[PDB]
Design a protein around this nucleic acid. Sequence first.
DNA 1: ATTGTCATGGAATTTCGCA
DNA 2: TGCGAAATTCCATGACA
DNA 3: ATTGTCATGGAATTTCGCA
DNA 4: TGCGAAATTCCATGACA
Lengths: 184, 184, 368, 368
Amino acid sequence: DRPQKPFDKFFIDYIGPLPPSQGYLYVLVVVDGMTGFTWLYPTKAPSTSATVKSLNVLTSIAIPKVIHSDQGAAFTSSTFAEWAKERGIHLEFSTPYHPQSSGKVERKNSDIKRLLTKLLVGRPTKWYDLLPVVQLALNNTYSPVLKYTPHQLLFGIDSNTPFANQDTLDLTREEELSLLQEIR
Amino acid sequence: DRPQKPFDKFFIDYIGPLPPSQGYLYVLVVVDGMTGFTWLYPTKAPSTSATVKSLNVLTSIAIPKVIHSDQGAAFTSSTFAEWAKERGIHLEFSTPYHPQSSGKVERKNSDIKRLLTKLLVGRPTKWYDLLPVVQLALNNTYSPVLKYTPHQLLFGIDSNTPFANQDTLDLTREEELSLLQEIR
Amino acid sequence: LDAELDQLLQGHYIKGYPKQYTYFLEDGKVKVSRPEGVKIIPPQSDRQKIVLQAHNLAHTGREATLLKIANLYWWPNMRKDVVKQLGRCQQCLITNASNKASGPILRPDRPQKPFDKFFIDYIGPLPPSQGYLYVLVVVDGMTGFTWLYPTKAPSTSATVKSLNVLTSIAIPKVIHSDQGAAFTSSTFAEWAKERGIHLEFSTPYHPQSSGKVERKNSDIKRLLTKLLVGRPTKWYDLLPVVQLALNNTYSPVLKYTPHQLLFGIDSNTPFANQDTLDLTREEELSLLQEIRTSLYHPSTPPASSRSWSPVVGQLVQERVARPASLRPRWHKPSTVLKVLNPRTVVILDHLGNNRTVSIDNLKPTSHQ
Amino acid sequence: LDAELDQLLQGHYIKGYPKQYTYFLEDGKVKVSRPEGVKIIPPQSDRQKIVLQAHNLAHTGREATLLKIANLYWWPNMRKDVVKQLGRCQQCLITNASNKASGPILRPDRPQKPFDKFFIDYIGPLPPSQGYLYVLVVVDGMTGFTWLYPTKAPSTSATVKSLNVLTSIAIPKVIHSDQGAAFTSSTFAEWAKERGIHLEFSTPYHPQSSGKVERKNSDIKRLLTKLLVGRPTKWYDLLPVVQLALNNTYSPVLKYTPHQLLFGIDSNTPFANQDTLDLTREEELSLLQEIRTSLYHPSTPPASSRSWSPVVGQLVQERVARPASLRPRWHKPSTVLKVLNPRTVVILDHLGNNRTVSIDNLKPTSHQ
DNA sequence: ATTGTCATGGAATTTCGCA
DNA sequence: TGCGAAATTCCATGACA
DNA sequence: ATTGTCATGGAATTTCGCA
DNA sequence: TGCGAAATTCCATGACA
Ligand SMILES: CC(C)n1c(C(=O)N(C)C)c2c(c(O)c1=O)C(=O)N(Cc1ccc(F)c(Cl)c1)CC2
Ligand SMILES: CC(C)n1c(C(=O)N(C)C)c2c(c(O)c1=O)C(=O)N(Cc1ccc(F)c(Cl)c1)CC2
Ligand SMILES: [Mg+2]
Ligand SMILES: [Mg+2]
Ligand SMILES: [Mg+2]
Ligand SMILES: [Mg+2]
Ligand SMILES: [N+]
Ligand SMILES: [N+]
Ligand SMILES: [Zn+2]
Ligand SMILES: [Zn+2]
């Protein structure tokens, strides 16, 4: 069996709804399986259409052999299947109610949610603008298991924006009281 | 004493009034002394101004050392003298009532009048258009005395329009009866 | 195809597949262990399709197409099949640039006499001066003597008016011009025939062909520019001055001014040359004739190390004249009917019309 | 002047007037019998005026000016006085062309890493497609990897929007651009500083300086053209395809696609190279590092046989950018303050401002 | 059925002035 | 029959938009 | 304060297959 | 250890308007 490589598997999933930001409501999340590299695309809906539109941007940079996802409506549609077939991408589904990814990926997806949550409090409506910096963060974050960041694994070089400040990522007591207040 | 050359002396004179042609009434006549080459310029008046305007065309091709003329008003004006001085052209006047040129020139000027008269009868109003061909004629006309045409003396080559037909130049009996009728 | 590859698997020799490599089967396909690695040998009946898929990704040329194919496949003489395709890609052939330059320029013989040949051309539009916007420039081939006429348009009518005035002096055998609207009109053809003047046209979109007058335009614009430095561009009143100035300017290589070549003696202008003061006119014209024939004449330069010259029946393509944004710079291929000289050809253009065309406006179709 | 010429008439020797010729008087002027003929020797106090009258007839250069003068005069070292004048003719100096070419182009070192240097530029206006008219092209220096973004204008705002999306992936040390309005705005400078990106600008009116991205524009337009053959120019929908196609196209000299230099492995695209199938990613990246450093790098070509190179304190002139009809093509002379490299200089422009300028947009002032 | 040209000013080469 | 300097010739460069 | 580039397809050169 | 042909490398040409 051949060693794992970037572009072997993209793990895609939606996150939302979120509060309106520049008319956007969701984030399509793509994580490269081998590298843990993360791409984020804002959408207005978790639809096949918004998925295709967004994946068309990413897949004009690099094409995964396999997309793995849960059995979300947008991913199980025959339009999405047609789309993937055109590009020779195999589609891969976790069985309903039992999502399996990989450790590396699960943890990544965890960081993403927590990191989002942290920044959308205080400014629940400005997240669209922060997606770029959210990604830089995620991708220049050091992996406990591998000696490297996703950037490093993807490109084979150090990044010009390292995030030496491994952050709190937890809600400060000020924010728990104004997060239990925001959703009220 | 040095031999005679083109551009040594231009003999200028007016001819007119003639019948209106394209709003023109006179012909300024320039004959190069040495070569007998002829230039014709239509003017609306025998004025210093029309002379300067016309000579400015010719003198932008070649400049005579000397202009000879009679004591016509247009040529004796101080404007015309200023004009000539600017260009370093010496002005030369025949004494009043006694015009002297040269044999070659006198004969040339004769041909010009007669040739004009011949063509302005029948079409006394179309002469403007014929000035070019009148000149070609005059200039490709063989000189009895010198073995050559003015064109040949000017340019040192045969012309592409020779006038082998040395013409009648005289008024045919049809034209004398319709010239004694036109001016009636 | 399937026959060829069969004989091969069972260890026989087929011309083109070198013997020293082991050709096996795997995943239902014929493979081979080449130094570079293990590549699939597709059946001949699949090869055209493969070459085409590779090529079409970015419409790549020889090597860049080969390198895609080589990633997965091997067969005998791959580039031959690649080239075959490049030669049939309409889009590649009409879009790519040439990488072969024209053969060396001709240096036509100088017209033998004043008035043998005129070259004429328009300059402009210039800044409005007295309601005029253009200049008709007439240059005598042999002498370089030049006449200038301001016009309101580069029109036949203005051309005709100017040339009536000029041809009061002499009539030229031939007038050479480019294919401007003014010179190609039937009215202008008439005007010429009426006078026994032969109209001679440049191959289209190739002003080097009117090089004599073109080059004079440069001097005309250059002097006009200098004379208008720090003043408003009121050029109409300078044309006469410019004319006279240029006609009396020495060409350092000839050692003569165009006036001198035209007349054999300076007129009353500044710094007039006096050398023939004691010769009779006839001695002068005799000397003029000798000066006219002995003028320096340049020679055809060496060919660039990668030029092409047209050959009868060659496939060549004419450059599109005013190509639209994102449209091909070349017309479809066409055939050389006649080689007029090494720099001028007649082509049959698939329409098919005869066009007389400069080699500079052609490239040779690639891959035959 | 009158003193010098006196001593001469009375048979004495004056340095510069050769002894073997007879210098007489006639018509109130000093003459001499030279092989060519008899020429007037004007008094030194008249010579500047004479040279100037000759020169001014048609604003002629060295020889063509000399030949006018020689018609009437002789004195010692005429061309020296002629050249003196040419050097002082404002009009000649700002109107004439150069006849010295630039020194050989530099071939800057390839950026060492992906993201070390971006080159960016706009293409367009193109035919309206979905309301878009331009394309922002971003080319990674090291890899050649390219991103394309359609825009409605070549504006800072559109530049910023596009680059926010791009820099989601990585942030470059340096972005190099030409001096387009979009890239030189203070809004854009802010945007860069905000991110610790250094803005690096081309010398103005010298796109060769953005050669990396410029050259990519060619391929982008070329492929777009081919893909739009026989169809309406609806390019907006092809940008993504074009991008992907180009990023995965081999450079025949490197033997790599920009994708490969960027990632060290092909993604799921046609004809993906499989050679590193058995290496671990880490073995792969190790091999990528070695491939990146060993890429072909071209060298500075030989100088043309008549080039010039800038020297500190030299008088040079900057080419006018958008010269009006019948106006000089050159600015007044100015001085080389610093020679940044043999092809780039700082000049003090008589205003006087410091301008950093390409040698290609300069000529060396003639006659010192 | 048509076709490059030539001013320009440093450098290269030749000629001149003298011996 | 040879030197140093001036004169002349050579010729790449660039623009006719 | 900055700096040309590189796809292209014939030709030139090297390598390959075989002996 | 040398041949003929295929493969690879060279590199001038031209366009980024
Ligand atoms: C109007 C057409 C026929 N025409 C055109 C033309 O083809 N277009 C599209 C303007 C041109 C010129 C015309 O005179 C002319 O009449 C013309 O001189 N040049 C300048 C130029 C450029 C390079 C050269 F080497 C030379 Cl001797 C001259 C540009 C094109
Ligand atoms: C808008 C300005 C700054 N600008 C300009 C400009 O100076 N003008 C006047 C349009 C140009 C270009 C820009 O990209 C650009 O941004 C540009 O690419 N080319 C094409 C070209 C020509 C020759 C070459 F070698 C290369 Cl490399 C590219 C033309 C001028
Ligand atoms: Mg989901
Ligand atoms: Mg009178
Ligand atoms: Mg022209
Ligand atoms: Mg550009
Ligand atoms: N010829
Ligand atoms: N460098
Ligand atoms: Zn193609
Ligand atoms: Zn001047």
